[PDB]
Structures are given as structure tokens and as C-alpha cells.
Amino acid sequence: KVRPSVKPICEKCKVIRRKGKVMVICENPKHKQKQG
Amino acid sequence: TPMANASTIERKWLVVDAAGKTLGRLSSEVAAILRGKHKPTYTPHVDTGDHVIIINAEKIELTGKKLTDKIYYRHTQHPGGLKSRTALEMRTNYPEKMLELAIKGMLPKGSLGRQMFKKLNVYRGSEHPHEAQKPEVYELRG
Amino acid sequence: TKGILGRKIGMTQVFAENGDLIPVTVIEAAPNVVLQKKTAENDGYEAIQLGFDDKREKLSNKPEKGHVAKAETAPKRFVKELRGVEMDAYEVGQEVKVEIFSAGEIVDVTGVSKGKGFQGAIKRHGQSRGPMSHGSRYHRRPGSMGPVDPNRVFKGKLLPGRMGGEQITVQNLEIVKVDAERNLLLIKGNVPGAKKSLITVKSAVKS
Amino acid sequence: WITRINAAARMNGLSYSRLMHGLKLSGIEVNRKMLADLAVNDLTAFNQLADAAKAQLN
Amino acid sequence: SRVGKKLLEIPSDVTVTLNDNNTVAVKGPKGELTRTFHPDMEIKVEDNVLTVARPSDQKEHRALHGTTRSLLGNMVEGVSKGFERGLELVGVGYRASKSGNKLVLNVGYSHPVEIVPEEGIEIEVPSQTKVVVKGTDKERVGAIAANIRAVRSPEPYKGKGIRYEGEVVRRKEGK
RNA sequence: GGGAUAAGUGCUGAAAGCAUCUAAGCAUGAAGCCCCCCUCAAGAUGAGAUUUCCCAUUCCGCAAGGAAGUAAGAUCCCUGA
RNA sequence: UUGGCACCUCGAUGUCGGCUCAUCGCAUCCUGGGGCUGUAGUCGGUCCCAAGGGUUGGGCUGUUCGCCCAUUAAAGCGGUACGCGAGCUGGGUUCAGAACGUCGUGAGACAGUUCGGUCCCUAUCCGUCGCGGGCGCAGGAAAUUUGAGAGGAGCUGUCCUU
């Protein structure tokens, strides 16, 4: 997904700032977010 | 009645090596020489150019992201027919248009920004056929 | 890429091998003479000038009389390059002719089109006529130039002009036969250029 | 002529922003700026004034 | 809780030079590896001990501190052990062999898939199921096997195509 | 078809011992971009190129220069497409 | 878009909509490529990049819009003086004629309706699209060129196999 309020949902989600974009990466692939 | 020269001016060929230099801080150091901001017989309308042959046109660095984020724009007179291009395409394919566009952006435009620009040459490093004029090496002021 | 050049004559129908019917051109293009070998050791690029359809000496000049001295033949009207053949198998003075081609060689063909003269906006660009009735006076004409705010005509707005006279490549043809007995090509389809104009018969860019 | 001072003051390694401080101190020189220029027509008369500048630049 | 202050041991026989600047050229039985390092990193080579002597303490340097050691820790122990990966074909009309040195995969596309390895890379064919790449550079070997997994990426319903050994595919119950 | 790219997808790996597509390093990837295909085009005053030609006159102006006749070629004029 | 304000124009800036000719912006209808799927394949929803190209023939009404007929890969929006009347058509609004309802005591009135109702211009300049004459290109000439740069093309549907 893509949204300006990128947050982890469950505690299995890491928040990794790639490429100037605060991306959240997790196990479950419905957590997959980005502001961009 | 101060002095103002006319057709008694002697022109002296130079060489600037752009190797570990930015774009960018030497254009404003080649423009002032092409326009003649160092000869004391400086009368602004009389083509005072001791002029520069640039060597190592293939070697120019420029800081920041600006190989890929600085982009040229050469729009035609046809509608929406601009052909833009990044600096990395211009550093590889032909930088002879990189520096000559830079100096042409420096100079006062008109009929001197042609005549100051007819003085400049750019050669890709380091070969240039100007043996028969012997340019002294202008190291830069920085 | 092989390529010869020459006049054409006209159109025919030649059926072959089936009940077919083939639209066939007739080309006079034999034989070419290699007059000058453009070399990348001197000029940067690789080409071969070919001359065709020799003329009598009243029509040829001393700058051009001496130009055929390297091939040592008569003066010759129609000269063009060809970038750029497999290097080389040619010598300056070797009479290139029809023998290369065959029934199956896919071939692009270039030539200077039939000039029709000064023609208007429908015929020159395929533009469409307005209404021919209903009181309308606007017919046969190109109509609206552009908007109002830029206050000018954008470059490229189609208009009347002189139609024709360009050089047109027409691709992917099929050379039908080879007639080195009569100096005659045979190409499927329509080939641009008016009657008896000059036509360069290349080999194509495939596939 | 302010350009025609820097085109001579930089031959001797100074800047107009510093040179016209030098003439204001070493000397109270009220030299005409066309004529501290002219001091170029007959160089190195200007440099010997630029020599007078550097002594109070230290 | 650092990496570049750990030590690299070379007993035998993976010999490492200080070929300036700074082209640290590993040798050994398997081959030779030449990683070029940026000039802030000042490698101090003790008695059989490769190290890292950092220039200073910035976030530029710290992020470059642990890497230049742990590139070599991949390199030096790669000219003794080598490196290899394990691919695990799961599927029905899916099989594997090599021919010449191309890797012929009859993945369920209507044409077979061939993967040409590079020099110093040995993609073994152990059996019909598994495929093993073997080489020296981890940024090459795993990257070649990443060029293999994208032939048939594992669908979540039936985990198909190329698949690393071992690996857990998230499973859906398609109905 | 070739070459670099978008969103992706990554292989390595740190800072933050693991992890982590990135921060150094290497990829792949679009009818997008740049060429390849076709057309114009050195008035591109930065006027490019190679081939082959005609020659290096006659007079004035001591000179700088200016005329008159002429080669290579072309033009007017004519039959036309 | 309906608006507010009255700041260019009331010694005139032609107003709706069609026909031509387009360009451009993408906030995308397709087509190319992907994350997620409450994605088993099939066909989708949704979010991403992407303007290169395509973006229909009617019936009705002046209609833009709208509905419906049948196709389609789809039948995108939107700006450009709600593009475009010194390029066209006037079908409506809003000239006089003429009626009908309504209102007024009456002349007449009405964004309530209806039938009829002179759409002028030899292109000066800049533009645009073709054609020429000079001159220059360190001597005059004839051929063939190179390509810095400029455009054009850029769409896809089926079917059969696998």
C-alpha cells in the first residue's frame, strides 16, 4: 500500500527508511506500506 | 580622456585543465578571462579576449546528485517538443556542449556573447590541434 | 547490405507457379560501376559511390570526366553512395549488376517520388472536406489554425504546399526474377517514383 | 576604473576591497579613481603605490 | 556490538596482500578476489590477522566501518570453503538438468528456461529436484541464484518453481 | 533489436554483532527515455568532409590596391516534360 | 461548475452548441509493467509507475449533458477567450412581425412556450506552409557526402498450437 501516514500495525513490522521514503516492511505482506 | 583601447590589443591563448574541478567554479573563471577581467587595458566594448582552450572535457566532476538530477532542456519551436537530457548522458555522449552552453550562459549576451564565445574552444582530453599558437598554461585561482 | 540503383520502366502482371497474379515493376538498374570507395581511414565512414546510365561526352564536364579516371570508363550520370556494404569484395572498376539478387531476397527500395505540383490541404495531408451543402461556404479548406492566447500558429499546422518531390523508401519488397540477359529486375508491388526516374534497389533491414 | 584597478591589483596579488583600504591607511591618499587607474597607463607607477598599500597590510 | 572490531584469521593458505590503493587482493587455493575499498579504510595486517583501523567516528564512517572487514570475511573464507546455495524445485511438470553449461529448466512455461553461469561459477545438477550453484563471491553466487528464483517465483497456494533450501512460503487456502 | 532508467523485484552487507534492496557495491525491469526504421539537413557564421577540374594572365597605382580580357565551368535565348 | 468583487474593455473584447484542425496537462478508459488481494485457473477490486499511440456509427432533442440501439482492446476527463465566425453553419437565446397561457384597468410584460427573421472585409505586419533572388563559407568550379539538429512513425483484435 501507499499512504502518507506509514505506521507499523503489529509488532512484527520493521520501519526501514529506504531511498528517502519511510517504508515499513513486515512478515505479513498486507503490512507493505510506503509514503511515495 | 581616460584611456580606451581600440584595435591595438594583443590576444594570448591559454589552457584550463578541468580534471578535478567543478563546472561551476571555473566557468566564472574562464568567462572573466574570455571577457577580459584581468587585462588592465579593459574597455568593455572592444573584444578584449585573451582566450582559452579547454582540455580534459571528458573529466569534469560536479558535486551533489547533479549527474542525474540536473537536466538540460533544448526545446524546439514545435509544440511540446522539448528534448531534455540528464548530465550523465551529456558527460558520456558529448560534453563539448556541456561547457559551451555554460560559458554562453556566463557572458553578456548580444554581439559580444557571440564574439566572446567565438574565442572559446573546447577539446576532449587531452588532444587539441593548437600546436601552432602555443597556449601558456593558466593554472587556476580557486 | 547489397544495393544497386537504376531507372524503372513500368508495371506488369507476372503469374508464377500457381494461379497467382503478381504486380511487378521493371527496373533497368544494370550495370553499376564502382567509381570511388569511400573509406573510414580517410573520411570517417564507409561507403561506395556507384554510377549508372552513361551519357555522351557533350553532357559531361572536365571536373567529372576526370572523376571516372579511377574506374577508367565512360562518364556516367547518376551517382549515389551506399552505406555500407560488407567490406569489401569490391574494387574501383568492377561492374556491379543484377546477379546478386534472387527470388527470395527481401529488399527495401528508395526513389524520388512523382511530383504532383502545388496541391491543397485535402490532397497534401489527407485532411477532410467540410460540408458541401446546408448553406456552408467552408469546404475544401484547412480551417482553424490554433487557439487565441498563444497568438500564433504552432509550427507544424498543415497547409497547402508543393506535394511530392521527396525521396521515399518503400520496404520489404520481393525481387521476383533476375534477368542478366536483358538487364532487368522484377519487383513485387508498387515502387515509388514516376516513369523513368532513378531508383535505388537496396537489400532490406531484416528481420 | 574599479575594474581597471582589480585588473592591476590582482597582478600584484591584492583585491580592490582590500586595496582601497590600503590606500586609505598607508597614505591618506585622495587619488582620483580615474587617476589611480591611469597609474596603469604608466605601470609600474601603480605597483609602487600598491607597494605602499601592502606595508600597512601587515 | 561492533563488527569491524572483530578479527579475521588466516591460518592457511588464503594469502592476502596490501595492493594499493586499496585493492586488497585475496589469493588461495580456490582463486583470487579483488574488492576495491574506499580510501578512508586503513587496513592493518598483523601476524595472520586482518583488521580495520577506522579513520574517525562519523555515521559515514561507522556504516563503512563494519562492511570493509566483513567483505573480506566473505572473501577470505570463500577461498577456503567456497560458497554454495540450495535450490528446491517443487512442482509436477518441473524438472532440471544441465546441457553444456546452460541450466535447462523445464518449468511449466511452454519453452524451457536456460541460465548461463559466469566465469568462476559452477551450477551443479545434483538430481531432478535440487539445483546447487557453487562459487566464491556471495554477491555473485546468491545473485545468480536470485536470477534463478525469478524463473517461477513461489505461488502461495502450491509453492512452485525455484525455492531456496530451506525456506518457508506463506500458505493460502485457495478454494 | 541494443543501451541506460520508473514502480518493482533483489544478491551482499553494516551502521543498529542478528536482521536490514542502500548507506559504499553489483544487478533485472515498462507500449515510457535515447538510438536503431524513414524523412529533412553545413546559412551548423562552429558555413564540415572527400573526388576531380581550371590555373596561377594583361594593364595602371613605386606600394596597399584597382580595373580590362580569360580558362574550369555556368547564364541569357530556344524545343520542351 | 453555481458563485462573490467590479480591477482590462459599453468611440463595440461576438455570446450556446455542432463541422473542421488540433495541441497540452495528466488526477488514466485501454494497451506495457508491477504490489496487495476477501487473487484456486477465468474475469475482477484496489494502489502504483507510464503520455508513446488509440481513443466509434447512430435515435432523440438547438442542445453540452443525458438515456437507449449495436459494436468495441476501450468508447477517459480537463485547459487552451466554457479552443476555433477577418475558417463555416444560426438550430436556441435576445431586434422589429405573429400567436397562446398568465399578469396589468391599459400601453404592454415574462430565464413560460411557439412559426418566420440581410452573419460584411481585395491580408499591412508577426506568424504558419511551399517556392525563389542576392550574399557568405579566405581563388573560382562540378559531384557525393558526414550529421550537431529538426521532424514522421509509436495503436492493436482475433485465430491455431503449445
UniProtKB/Swiss-Prot annotation, chain A:
SUPFAM superfamilies given in the database record: Ribosomal protein L36
Species the sequence originates in: Bacillus subtilis (strain 168)
Quaternary structure and interacting proteins, as annotated: Part of the 50S ribosomal subunit.
Name this protein carries in UniProt: Large ribosomal subunit protein bL36
Family: Belongs to the bacterial ribosomal protein bL36 family.
PROSITE patterns: RIBOSOMAL_L36
Database matches in InterPro entries: Ribosomal_bL36, Ribosomal_bL36_sp
PANTHER family: 50S RIBOSOMAL PROTEIN L36, CHLOROPLASTIC, LARGE RIBOSOMAL SUBUNIT PROTEIN BL36C
Coiled coil (residue ranges): none
Curated annotation (Swiss-Prot), chain B:
Listed Pfam families: Ribosomal_L13
GO MF annotations in UniProt: mRNA binding; structural constituent of ribosome
A cellular component term, taken from the record's GO annotations: ribosome
Alphabetical UniProt keywords: Ribonucleoprotein, Ribosomal protein
InterPro entries, per the entry: Ribosomal_uL13, Ribosomal_uL13_bac-type, Ribosomal_uL13_CS, Ribosomal_uL13_sf
Any one Gene Ontology BP term: translation
Domain of life per record: Bacteria
PANTHER family given in the database record: LARGE RIBOSOMAL SUBUNIT PROTEIN UL13M (PTHR11545:SF2), RIBOSOMAL PROTEIN L13 (PTHR11545)
Subunit structure: Part of the 50S ribosomal subunit. Binds to Obg (AC P20964).
General function of this protein: This protein is one of the early assembly proteins of the 50S ribosomal subunit, although it is not seen to bind rRNA by itself. It is important during the early stages of 50S assembly.
Family statement drawn from the similarity comment of this UniProt entry: Belongs to the universal ribosomal protein uL13 family.
Protein name: Large ribosomal subunit protein uL13
Swiss-Prot record, chain C:
SUPFAM superfamilies: Translation proteins
S-S pairs: none
UniProt cross-references to Gene3D superfamilies, sorted A to Z: 3.30.160.810, Translation factors
GO molecular function: rRNA binding; structural constituent of ribosome
A single GO BP: rRNA processing
UniProtKB keywords: Ribonucleoprotein, Ribosomal protein, RNA-binding, rRNA processing, rRNA-binding
Chain intervals for the UniProt region annotation (Disordered): 121-151
Function: One of the primary rRNA binding proteins, it binds directly near the 3'-end of the 23S rRNA, where it nucleates assembly of the 50S subunit. Strongly stimulates 23S rRNA precursor processing by mini-ribonuclease 3 (MrnC); 20-30% DMSO can replace L3, suggesting the protein may alter rRNA conformation.
Family named by the database record: Belongs to the universal ribosomal protein uL3 family.
HAMAP family documented for this protein: Ribosomal_uL3_B
NCBIfam families the UniProt entry points to: L3_bact (TIGR03625)
Quaternary structure, from the entry: Part of the 50S ribosomal subunit. Forms a cluster with proteins L14 and L19. Interacts with RNA helicase CshA.
Stated name of the protein: Large ribosomal subunit protein uL3
Curated annotation (Swiss-Prot), chain E:
Keywords per UniProt: Ribonucleoprotein, Ribosomal protein, RNA-binding, rRNA-binding
SUPFAM superfamilies, sorted: Ribosomal protein L6 (SSF56053)
PROSITE patterns per UniProt: RIBOSOMAL_L6_1 (PS00525)
An MF annotation (GO) of this entry: structural constituent of ribosome
UniProt GO BP: cytoplasmic translation
Pfam families per the UniProt record, alphabetical: Ribosomal_L6
Record keyword Ribosomal protein present: yes
Similarity field: Belongs to the universal ribosomal protein uL6 family.
PANTHER family for this protein: 60S/50S RIBOSOMAL PROTEIN L6/L9 (PTHR11655), LARGE RIBOSOMAL SUBUNIT PROTEIN UL6M (PTHR11655:SF14)
Function according to Swiss-Prot or TrEMBL: This protein binds to the 23S rRNA, and is important in its secondary structure. It is located near the subunit interface in the base of the L7/L12 stalk, and near the tRNA binding site of the peptidyltransferase center.
The protein's name: Large ribosomal subunit protein uL6
Organism: Bacillus subtilis (strain 168)
Gene designation: rplF
